[PDB]
Amino acid sequence: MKGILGVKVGMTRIFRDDRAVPVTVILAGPCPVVQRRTPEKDGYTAVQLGFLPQNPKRVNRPLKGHFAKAGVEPVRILREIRDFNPEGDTVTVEIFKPGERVDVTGTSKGRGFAGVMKRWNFAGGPDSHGAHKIHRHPGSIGNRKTPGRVYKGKKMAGHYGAERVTVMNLEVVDVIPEENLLLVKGAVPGPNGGLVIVRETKKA
Amino acid sequence: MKTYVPKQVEPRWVLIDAEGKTLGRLATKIATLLRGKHRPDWTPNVAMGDFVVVVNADKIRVTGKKLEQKIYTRYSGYPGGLKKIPLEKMLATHPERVLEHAVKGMLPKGPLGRRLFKRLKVYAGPDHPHQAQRPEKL
Amino acid sequence: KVRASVKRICDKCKVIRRHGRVYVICENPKHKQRQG
Amino acid sequence: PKGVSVEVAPGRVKVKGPKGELEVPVSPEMRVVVEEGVVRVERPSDERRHKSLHGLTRTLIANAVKGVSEGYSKELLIKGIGYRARLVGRALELTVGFSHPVVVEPPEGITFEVPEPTRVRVSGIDKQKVGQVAANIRAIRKPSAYHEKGIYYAGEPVR
RNA sequence: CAAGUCUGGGCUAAGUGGUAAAGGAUGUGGCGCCGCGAAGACAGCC
RNA sequence: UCGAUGUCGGCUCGUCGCAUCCUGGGGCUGAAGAAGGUCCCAAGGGUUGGGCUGUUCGCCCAUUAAAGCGGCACGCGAGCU
RNA sequence: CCGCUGAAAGCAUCUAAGCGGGAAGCCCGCCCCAAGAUGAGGCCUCCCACGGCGUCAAGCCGGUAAGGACCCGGGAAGACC
C-alpha cells in the first residue's frame, strides 16, 4: 500500500484530450521515513513518515535522531502508512504515475454547532401556513409511552465537520517530480494549506 | 459466639485443563474454586478464592449440536443492535471467551462477583504466561 | 408442494424424511411435496 | 481381489492397487483387519445405528477396491445441433450454445477423454469424484428443453 | 443458591423439555395377533 | 386513569414486524421462446409527482422495477398545524 | 432449492457416515468512532535521584528534571471550554 504525507494547496482545471478537468493540486514534499514498524516488535508493519521540514530545533523529548534522516523532525509531525515498506531513505512523488488511482484523507471544514437540516438535510418546518417558531426545527423525535425514550444515534444538532474524511479512488492526472507536486480529480477534504494523506486506492 | 472469620488468606494458584471436557461441567467447578468454597473458611463477604488458570481452552467438548445452535448475544445500545453469533464462531475466534462467559454467569452478580471473575485466567493453548506456582488439579 | 397434509398421490410417489422434514417424491414432478 | 492390497488402521482403511491407493474412512463399530483371500465386515449390537453402518461400510470399501483395479468408467452424450466438445491439455472446452464456450479444468486423479466430438467420458480411481464431476458437467447444460439439446448420461428422456 | 454433579431401571436426540389444534409422517422404543416361507419371489436382471 | 392519560387527519422525524409491492435466490406450471400463474427462501436497499375530499381510505391523471400491508397511546400538539 | 457417493430396507432414497453446488440475505472485506477495552494494551524517544523528617518511600514537605501550565498574538478550530 503506497502512500505519502502531503498538503492540499488548492485547485484549478486543466485541459486533457480536449476537455476541462478540474484538479486539486497537492504538494507531497519528500517524506523522510523516520521509523519502521515491524511485526516482530510492534505487531503489525507500517512506515512512519515525516513531512513539513523546517524546525528551530524544537526537539526536546523526541530528539529521536535514531534514524538517519532525523533531519530535524517535521513541523507537521509524522504519520504511519499501514502496510508499506520501501527504499528506506525518503518517499518522493515518483511513487505515483499518471493514470493511477488513489484514496485521499484529510480534515473536513469545521462547521461548528450545525443545525440539523445542515448536519443532516432534515426537512425543516414550513416557511408559512403553520405557526412560526419551528421553521428550522427537527419535528418529532419519538413515539410515546413505548419506548418512552429516544434511541441511540438520533440525528440531531451539534459540532459538525472538522473531522477526518477519506474520499476514494481519485485519478492522478499528473505528477511534477521537479516540484513534489501532484494533480488529482479535484475535491479533496479540507481547506487549502491543510494536511492530507494520499494512498493507493481500493478498487483492488 | 465465635467469629471464626479469617485474617487475609494466602491465595492459591491452580492450573486446570481437561481439554476434552464439557464446558459448564468444567465451568461449574471453576466457579466453586473462585469463591473460597471448597475451603472451610468460606467467607461470603471477602474473596478468599483461588486463582484459576485454564490452559488449552478451545478443545472444550460440548454435547448435542451446539455449534450454529448455541447463540451468544450482544445488544449495542442502538436500533437494530442485536448481534447473534454461533458458538462455532466464538471458538473460531475468541475461543478463550467461550469458557469465560459460561463461568461468569455462574458467579454472583455484585462487585465481589466481578472481582472474583478477574481471578480466573483463561488461555487457548497450552502455555500459561505466568509462572507463579500452579498445583495442577485433575 | 408446501402443505401440512402431505400424502402419497399415486403408487410411484414416495415418502422421505430428510433433514428434519417430511418430503414426498414421485416419478412425475407435479407430485413433489414438502411438509410445512 | 488380486494385485490389490488392504491394510487397516483405526478409523481408516487403506486400499492399494494397480491404478492407485485410496483411504476409506470407517466406523469403529467394527473389528476389521485384513481377512482371508477376501475382506469381510461385521457389526456389534444389532441396533439402528450399527445395522445402517454395516453394509454402508461394506460398500464404501467395495467401491474402493474396484477403483484401484480400474473403475474409471462413466460417459456423457452431448445432443443438439451446434454443441460439441474438444480436449485441451487435460481440460474440456465444451461449447453448448452459450455465447462463449465453457472450459472445465480437471480435478486431481481424473481424466477426461474426447473420443467423438459428442461423447465424453470421465476416468478416475475413485467414484465419488467421478460421479460428482460428471454432474458438474451435466449441470453446465442439463437437458429437458421440451426435448433434445443439452448433455445427457446414458440415461434417457421422456416426451 | 442452603442441601446429592446420590443409587437402580427405562425412554428421548427435538435444547423436545423451555407452555397450542384439526390434521399429516418407512421418527423412535415396548407390548399384542394374524398372513404365510426346501406347493423354497418379499426386493432385485429373461 | 374524571384533585384531567389533549381525543381525527396533515406535517416533521423516524424505528420495528413479515403475512413481500419492487429488486436477489428457487420448485411446480395447463412452462415452446418472450411474458405470466402459483407456491417456497429472502426486508439489504427501494417503494414517485399531481387532480378531488379536512379526510383515513378511495377513485382518477402521468409515470414507475415497484407504486406492499401493518405496529410504535388509530407512533409523534411540553415539535408545528 | 439441486446434486455426488450411500445403508438401515438385496430395490429405492441429497442422509442415517461422509462430499459438492446454491440468494440484493448472514460473516469478513470498504468508510468513520474507538483502551474509562478500570480486561485502562503496544512501540519510539526522553528525565532521573534522599536534599529533611514519621510507625520508614510519602501516607514527606521544600526546591527540581524531562516536560507542562498560566499571560499574550492569532486560526477555513470554536457558544464557553
Separation between Cα atoms, residue D23 and residue D26, nearest integer Å: 9
DSSP E strands in D19-157: the ranges are: 20-25, 75-79, 87-88, 91-94, 102-104, 110-113, 119-124, 150-152
SS3 A11: strand
- Which bases of chain G come closer than 7 Å to a protein CB? 1-9, 12-21, 27, 30-33, 39, 41-46, 66-68, 76-79
Separation in Å, CA of A5 to nearest CA in chain B: 35
SS3 A5: strand
Beta-strand pair A113-114/C33-35: unpaired
**Cα R_g (chain B), whole angstroms:** 17
Hey, how many other C-beta atoms are within 10 angstroms of the C-beta on A195?
17
Inter-CA distances, A150 with A135, A140, A142, A155, Å: 22, 11, 6, 11
SS3 D52: helix
Q: Is the CB of C25 under 7 A from strand E?
A: no
Cell (9 digits) for B104: 461468569
Go through chain A and tell me how many residues it has: 204
CA C14 to C1' G13, whole Å? 9
Cβ pair D53, D44 in contact under 8 A: no
Cell (9 digits) for B9: 488468606
Query: How is residue D84 annotated by DSSP?
Result: B
Cell (9 digits) for B75: 445488544
The answer to whether the annotation marks C32 as part of a ligand binding site is: no
Q: Is the CB of A145 under 7 A from strand F?
A: yes
Q: Is the CB of C10 under 7 A from strand E?
A: no
- As a whole number of Å, the end-to-end CA separation of chain C is 9
Residue C22 β-bridge partners: C17
Hey, how many other C-beta atoms are within 10 angstroms of the C-beta on B77?
8
Query: How is residue A3 annotated by DSSP?
Result: -
SS3 A64: coil
Separation between Cα atoms, residue A57 and residue A48, nearest integer Å: 20
This PDB structure is determined at a resolution in Å of 3.3
Separation between Cα atoms, residue A84 and residue A36, nearest integer Å: 9
- Which bases of chain E come closer than 7 Å to a protein CB? 1, 5, 13-15, 21-29
Q: Is the CB of B80 under 7 A from strand F?
A: yes
Residue B45 β-bridge partners: none
Cell (9 digits) for B54: 485454564
CA A143 to C1' F71, whole Å? 12
D48 φ/ψ angles, rounded to the nearest 5 degrees: -50, -70
Experimental method: X-ray
Q: What is the DSSP string of A36-56?
A: EE-TTTTSS-EEEEE-----S
Q: Which of B121, B57, B117 is nearest to B91 (CA)?
A: B57
The answer to whether the annotation marks C19 as part of a ligand binding site is: no
SS3 A200: strand
Separation between Cα atoms, residue B42 and residue B2, nearest integer Å: 15
Q: Which residue has the cell 467394527?
A: D30
Q: Using the CB atoms, write b or e for C1-36: b if 16+ within 10 Å.
A: eeeeebeeeeeebeeeeeeeeeebbbeeeebebeee
- Which bases of chain F come closer than 7 Å to a protein CB? 10-16, 27-29, 31-32, 39-41, 72-73, 75-77, 79-81
The answer to whether the annotation marks C13 as part of a ligand binding site is: yes
SS (H, E, C) chain B: CCCCCCCCCCCCEEEECCCCCECCCCHHHHHHHHCCCCCCCCCCCCCCCCEEEECCCCCCECCCCCCCCCEEEEECCCCCCEEEEEHHHHHHCCHHHHHHHHHHCCCCCCHHHHHHHCCEEECCCCCCCCCCCCCEEC
**The one-letter amino acid at D138:** R
**Residues whose CB falls within 8 Å of the CB of residue A39, separated by 6 or more in sequence, listed in order:** A45
Give the B window 59-88 contacts with A, CB below 8 Å. Answer: 76-79, 81
Q: Which of residues 75-134 of A touch strand F (CB under 7 A)?
A: 120, 122-126, 129-131, 133-134
Q: Which of D25, D60, D29, D26 is nearest to D47 (CA)?
A: D29
Go through chain D and tell me how many residues it has: 159
Cβ pair A168, A95 in contact under 8 A: no
Cβ pair B99, B31 in contact under 8 A: no
Q: Is the CB of A149 under 7 A from strand F?
A: no
3-state helix, strand, coil in chain A (%, to 5): 0, 35, 65
Hey, how many other C-beta atoms are within 10 angstroms of the C-beta on A95?
20
**Residues whose CB falls within 8 Å of the CB of residue A100, separated by 6 or more in sequence, listed in order:** A171, A172, A200, A201
Q: Which of residues 17-36 of C touch strand G (CB under 7 A)?
A: 17-21, 25, 32, 34
Cell (9 digits) for D117: 466430438
The answer to whether the annotation marks C17 as part of a ligand binding site is: no
If you count DSSP H runs as helices and E runs as strands, how many of each does chain D have, helices first?
2, 10
Separation between Cα atoms, residue A35 and residue B134, nearest integer Å: 41
Q: Which residue has the cell 530545533?
A: A57
SS3 A167: strand
Q: Which residue does chain B place closest to A153, by CA atoms?
A: B78
Separation between Cα atoms, residue D44 and residue A139, nearest integer Å: 75
Hey, how many other C-beta atoms are within 10 angstroms of the C-beta on B132?
9
3-state helix, strand, coil in chain D (%, to 5): 20, 30, 50
**The one-letter amino acid at D62:** A
**The one-letter amino acid at A56:** P
If you count DSSP H runs as helices and E runs as strands, how many of each does chain C have, helices first?
0, 4
Cβ pair D54, D42 in contact under 8 A: yes
Nucleotide nearest to B65 (CA to C1'): E15
Separation between Cα atoms, residue D78 and residue D96, nearest integer Å: 9
**Residues whose CB falls within 8 Å of the CB of residue D51, separated by 6 or more in sequence, listed in order:** D43
Cell (9 digits) for A12: 484549478
Beta-strand pair B51-54/B13-16: parallel
Nucleotide nearest to A135 (CA to C1'): F80
Q: Which residue has the cell 466457579?
A: B31
Separation between Cα atoms, residue B95 and residue A5, nearest integer Å: 40
